[PDB]
Design a protein around this ligand. Sequence first.
Ligand code: HEC
Ligand code: HEC
Ligand code: HEC
Ligand SMILES: [Ca+2]
Ligand SMILES: [Ca+2]
Ligand SMILES: [Ca+2]
Ligand SMILES: [Ca+2]
Ligand SMILES: [Cl-]
Ligand SMILES: [Cl-]
Ligand SMILES: [Cl-]
Ligand SMILES: [Cl-]
Ligand SMILES: [Mn+2]
Lengths: 106, 106, 106
Amino acid sequence: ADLEDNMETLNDNLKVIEKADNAAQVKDALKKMRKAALDAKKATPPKLEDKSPASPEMIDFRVGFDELAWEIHDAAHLAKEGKVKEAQAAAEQLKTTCNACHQKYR
Amino acid sequence: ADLEDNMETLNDNLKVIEKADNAAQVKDALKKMRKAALDAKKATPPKLEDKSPASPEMIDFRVGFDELAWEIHDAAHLAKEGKVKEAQAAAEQLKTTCNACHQKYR
Amino acid sequence: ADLEDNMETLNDNLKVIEKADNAAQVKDALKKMRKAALDAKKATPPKLEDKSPASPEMIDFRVGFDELAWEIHDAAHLAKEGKVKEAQAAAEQLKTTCNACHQKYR
Ligand code: HEC
Ligand code: HEC
Ligand code: HEC
Ligand SMILES: [Ca+2]
Ligand SMILES: [Ca+2]
Ligand SMILES: [Ca+2]
Ligand SMILES: [Ca+2]
Ligand SMILES: [Cl-]
Ligand SMILES: [Cl-]
Ligand SMILES: [Cl-]
Ligand SMILES: [Cl-]
Ligand SMILES: [Mn+2]
């Protein structure tokens, strides 16, 4: 899907994790985030439309989602062993990676 | 940033507000809107390129962003109080200011 | 193409028209606008996903692209007969149809 759609998937499930009840809600929301972050790697963001497709900015953009997907996965590990509160805290820390990419390319 | 990017920022965050679930998002989206409104005030829109830079039309254009910035601020205050629906109602009334300027200078 | 992609096409080519220097560039810009308008007619905009597929709002949306396509046609005519200044002038009144649909459905 489109880049804005994948971002809405990231944003909406991050809030689900904030409010979540049990590990299953967290784990399901985190798996949807990981799919969206990988799908986002296929996109060219408007601010980099004019750059060459393998420019250092475009590489920085794409690897930002590898970084995000791995941090998502670390939080999902906490949830799958049942450390729901720690999973939620790890998910809140994802905002730093979100915000780092945004201040460059959003 | 260019007028066009500022307008994308305004439209994109308005849509984020319309779908938002908590006050924190609405607040952060409104703050990005206020930045882009003030930055857009520096631009000369294509329709007014051949008029004096201090023409009544250019003053009207620039004051429209003061108005938009203050209206955004009113909605931000509702979001800061946690009143999600009220801040969403106020953000939706922003369209009247968006529309009014477009009718003249789009 | 999805709705937003066709909108970017409409917007980019209207800007090309505003600053064109030959009737062949205009002619080319208008027909990519026509294709994007007709392709956009196939979409359901997010704010009307809640209405029936042939609701009065969905009809109003689709027929808006017919009115767009016919105004684009009038512009392409003026351009094909060398009036160029009148073509750009016709492309400028396109904007009222852009604005009208956005005010209801964006
Ligand atoms: C780069 C590596 C990014 C990472 C990591 C995240 N986001 Fe993002 N985001 C990015 C861009 C380039 C854009 C602009 C897209 C456009 O076409 O305008 C965005 C946008 C958003 C949005 C707005 C979506 C919309 O409908 O307009 C949201 C709500 C958003 N981003 C949230 C978000 C979250 C919660 C992230 C981490 C969990 C995250 N993003 C990561 C670039 C990047
Ligand atoms: C004048 C005082 C304006 C106000 C208030 C708002 N907008 Fe605007 N907009 C204005 C102009 C002169 C233009 C054309 C220049 C341009 O950027 O193309 C626009 C255009 C837009 C667009 C498309 C622009 C693009 O991407 O190139 C959008 C999506 C848009 N405007 C949205 C928008 C919203 C949601 C507003 C209120 C929150 C708003 N604009 C206010 C002038 C003015
Ligand atoms: C209805 C009949 C429309 C007409 C005619 C035009 N547009 Fe449009 N546009 C429409 C909708 C419902 C939407 C929202 C789509 C969404 O998924 O949110 C849009 C959006 C745009 C945008 C994108 C703004 C953004 O996402 O940042 C642009 C730049 C835009 N529209 C421009 C545009 C122009 C230049 C038009 C006339 C030539 C025009 N639109 C007509 C619906 C309709
Ligand atoms: Ca979108
Ligand atoms: Ca965008
Ligand atoms: Ca958008
Ligand atoms: Ca798209
Ligand atoms: Cl001044
Ligand atoms: Cl001033
Ligand atoms: Cl504010
Ligand atoms: Cl809008
Ligand atoms: Mn105040």
